[PDB]
Amino acid sequence: TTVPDLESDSFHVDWYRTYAELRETAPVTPVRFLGQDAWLVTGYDEAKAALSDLRLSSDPKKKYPGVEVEFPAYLGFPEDVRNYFATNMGTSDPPTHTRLRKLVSQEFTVRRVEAMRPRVEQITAELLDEVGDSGVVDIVDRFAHPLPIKVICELLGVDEKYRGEFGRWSSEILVMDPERAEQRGQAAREVVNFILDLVERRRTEPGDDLLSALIRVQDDDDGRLSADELTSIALVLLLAGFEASVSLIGIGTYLLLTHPDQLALVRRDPSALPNAVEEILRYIAPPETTTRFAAEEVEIGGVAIPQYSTVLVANGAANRDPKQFPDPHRFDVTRDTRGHLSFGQGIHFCMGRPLAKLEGEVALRALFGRFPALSLGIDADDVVWRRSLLLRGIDHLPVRLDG
Ligand code: HEM
Ligand SMILES: CC[C@H]1OC(=O)[C@H](C)[C@@H](O)[C@H](C)[C@@H](O)[C@@H](C)C[C@@H](C)C(=O)[C@H](C)[C@@H](O)[C@H]1C
């Protein structure tokens, strides 16, 4: 009768109740978004199956007869910039995906991540010393946002260039508004230009950073990264290396602030902080939806998805599927969070999980341990949520440091 429109307010206002209504009617249903027809998967079993079914491609660069592949996430991106945004593991199918991921894994290791633990502790300490001891402060602008950025910039050796402006480009990209399509494509071109200069700069002056190491990495069978592969990987690692963590920290702070019972338990038992981060991810997944393209007709949950269809897997909705997580709408730092889809599932499983968990744990521990009277600076129902199916988050969050 009525095909949902992902641009309506139903998907940005108490939107989880809207997901629950669709899932109950059909975990796989037709929808409209950005002017195109698509399928939305809101069931946990359906979502898991989808992400595991390789007939559902992750590569937007592939050409098929008489069809125009259009991933929403690239709204307003010129052809060349899109290619720069999509020649990396997250936008590649095996066997290309397999080799790109292996070459990067050789340098982006748990070892390199763990070695940054002290640095992350220090950056976190410094940002907190600067907020003061009292009054109202935007915890996002003064903490949640800068922390992940400083960490990713040091990992990739980013210093010069618009080190404070790319944050501005990244923001416009997180929103997909048909109106601001041109401004979105222009910001994307700016990030590309920025990466090209960075890579060229690093080739000229090597260091011990992750970028320098990827430029030299090579395997006997797999070989090495091409100039374009190298550029695109740097680009995504830079953007995805911090945006999602900013969401994790902001949303995590908000959640603990509105659930004293859960916060008390964390302050009491510190060894329980790791699972709290996991529940924060399950409750409100930053990457609410992930995109796939049907290279062949595929059946999901008894529903035949026609070949050449765009498929939107609602990771966020799946994490709220009652059949998988009982009392889904309840934030519980003590619940079993195994199987959530916030880090993905299958061959594209999120490579930054170790870094993300590190940043989340260190940040929330330092924040609440430094301010025992920390409280929200505004009414809970007045917090403004980012309008993005791509990456959910809180852009502004007033907190009272001394209660
Ligand atoms: C709270 C933080 C994070 C969340 C929730 C998150 C979530 C995800 C998800 C859902 C996927 C799979 C997407 C798909 O299947 O298409 C993914 C993939 C990936 N993530 Fe993360 N991520 C986070 C942080 C990071 C960080 C810190 C980095 C990098 C420093 C990173 C790098 C990647 C990469 C490279 C992939 C592509 C993996 C592949 O295609 O093989 N992520 N992430
Ligand atoms: C503009 C489109 C791109 O988005 C972004 O880079 C966003 C800023 C990130 O927050 C995304 C959402 C990530 O956090 C991860 C979930 C997925 C990421 C690692 C990919 O590989 C994926 C192909 C991605 O690059 C694109 C969707």
Number of domains in the chain: 1
Cβ–Cβ under 8 Å, residues 316 and 289: yes
Joined together, the tokens standing for residue 254 give 């908000």
Alpha-carbon distance of 137 to 143, in angstroms, equals: 10
374-396 in b/e burial notation, b at 16+ Cβ within 10 A? bebbeeeeebebbbbbbbbbbbe
Phi, psi of 299 (to 5 degrees): -110, 130
Q: Count how many residues are written for the chain.
A: 403
Residue 386 has what DSSP assignment?
A: P
What is the rounded distance in angstroms from the CA atom of residue 188 to the CA atom of residue 306?
31
Residue indicated by tokens 């494509």 = 185
Alpha carbons 12 and 212: distance in angstroms, whole number = 41
Distance from Cα 37 to the centre of ligand 2, integer Å: 22
User: How far does CA 34 lie from the centroid of its chain?
Assistant: 20
Q: Which residues line ligand 2 (CB under 6 A)?
A: 73, 90-91, 173, 236, 239-240, 243-244, 287, 390-391
Query: Which of the listed residues 114, 350, 390 should we mutate to test ligand 1's pocket, taking the one with most ligand atoms within 8 A of CB?
Result: 350
Q: Which residue, 311, 331, 185, 204, is CA-closest to 258?
A: 331
Residue 136: DSSP 8-state: E
Angle CA 193–194–199, to nearest 5: 100
Is 71 strand, coil or helix?
Answer: coil
Q: How far is CA 272 from the centre of its chain?
A: 24
Q: What is the residue with the minimal CA distance to atom 15 of ligand 2?
A: 240
Q: Are 359 and 120 in contact (CB under 8 A)?
A: yes
Of the candidates 381, 384, 379, the residue with the CA atom closest to the CA atom of residue 250: 384
Q: Is 58 in the pocket of ligand 1 (CB under 6 A)?
A: yes
**φ and ψ at 303, to 5 degrees?**
-110, 125
**Dist. CA 236 → ligand 2 center (Å):** 7
**Alpha helices, H only, 53-145:** 79-85, 96-105, 110-114, 117-129, 139
- Cα 241 to middle of ligand 2, angstroms: 9
Please pick, among 172, 279, 359, 361, the residue that the annotation labels catalytic. Answer: 359
Q: Is 276:333 a contact under the CB 8 Å cutoff?
A: yes
| Unique residue bearing structure tokens 């907020």 | 131
**CA separation for the pair 46, 42 (Å, rounded):** 7
- Closest ligand to Cα 356: 1
Report how far residue 392's alpha carbon sits from residue 379's, in angstroms, rounded to the nearest whole number.
20
Contact 401, 132 (CB under 8 A): yes
Tell me how far CA of residue 345 lies from CA of 52, 146, 223, 340, in angstroms: 7, 29, 27, 9
CB 124 within 8 A of CB 265: no
For the record, the structure tokens of 273 come out as 């902080």
Q: What are the beta bridge partners of residue 292?
A: 311
CATH number at residue 72: 1.10.630.10
CA distance 176 to 389: 8
Cα–Cα–Cα angle for 247, 283, 360, nearest 5°?
40
Query: Quick check: helix, strand or coil at residue 295?
Result: coil
Q: Are 284 and 252 in contact (CB under 8 A)?
A: no
Q: Look at residues 396, 387, 390, 393 and name the one whose alpha carbon lies nearest to residue 11.
A: 387
Q: Determine which residue's CA is closest to atom 10 belonging to ligand 2.
A: 240
Q: Is 400 helix (H, G, I), strand (E, B) or coil?
A: strand
Q: Return binding residues for heme.
A: 350
Residue nearest to atom 37 of ligand 1 (CA): 90
Three-class SS of residue 174? helix
Q: Which domain holds residue 201?
A: 1-403
H helix runs in 285-403, sequence order: 315-318, 353-370
Contacts of 287 (CB under 8 A, 6+ apart): 244, 315, 316, 342, 390, 391, 392
Helices (H), 165-308: 166-174, 181-204, 210-216, 227-240, 243-257, 260-268, 273-283
Active site residue 243: yes
C-alpha of residue 66 to centroid of ligand 1, in Å: 32
Look at residue 297 and give its three-state secondary structure.
Answer: coil
Q: Which two tokens stand for residue 306?
A: 């026609």
CB atoms within 10 A of CB 177: 15
Tokens of 249: 């920290």
Q: Nearest to residue 234, comparing CAs of 259, 207, 215, 253? A: 215
Gyration radius (Cα) of the chain, Å: 21
- CA-nearest residue for atom 25, ligand 2, is 236
First to last CA, the chain: 51
CB–CB of 259/284 below 8 Å? no
Q: CA-CA distance, 403 to 396, in Å (whole number)?
A: 18
Helix 353-370 / helix 273-283 crossing angle, nearest 10 deg: 110
Q: Is 245 a catalytic residue?
A: yes
What are the residues whose beta carbons fall under 8 Å from the beta carbon of 354, sequence distance 6 or more?
A: 110, 113, 114
Instruction: State the sign of the Cα–Cα–Cα–Cα dihedral 22, 28, 31, 34.
Output: positive
Could you give phi then psi for residue 352, rounded to 5 degrees? -95, 10
Partnered with residue 385 across adjacent β-strands are 394
At how many Å resolution was this determined? 2.1
Q: How far is CA 305 from the centre of its chain?
A: 26
Provide the pairing of β-strand 36-41 with 310-313.
parallel
Please give the Cα distance from 399 to 368 (Å, whole number): 12
